[PDB]
Homo-oligomer: A and B are copies of this chain.
Amino acid sequence: FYKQCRSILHVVMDLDRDGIFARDPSKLPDYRMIISHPMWWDLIKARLTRYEYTSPSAFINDMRLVVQNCYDYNREESPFSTLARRIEIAMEDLFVTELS
């Protein structure tokens, strides 16, 4: 299932044109006070290279955390949240298509 997970991560990383969810967000204002488990695409990619995921569900957990953290940190009306919803719809549909 790693080939499929790697392929899905490549899709969301391309959808995120400016890479706003790609790098460590922990230095953003009050990020560590608000978000319990920061997550970002480059960490998920590294976890795939390190074989940390033993099931598709474990990869899906971390992918879901990136977009849920966006909604918990940013306002609903923010274009960051607009983009995260598009990414969420795309990746959730690809999980069903490729990993179920």
Contact = CB atoms under 8 A, between A and B. Distances in A.
Interface of A: 17-18, 20, 27-31, 34, 73-75, 77-80, 82-83
B17 A79 contact: no
A13 B83 CA distance: 27
Contact of A82 (B20, B30, B80): B30
Q: Count this chain's copies in the assembly.
A: 2
9 contacts: A17-B29, A20-B28, A28-B80, A29-B79, A30-B79, A31-B79, A34-B79, A74-B80, A78-B78
Q: In this complex, which of A28, A74, A77, A79 has the most chain B Cβ atoms within 10 angstroms of its Cβ?
A: A79
A83 B73 CA distance: 13
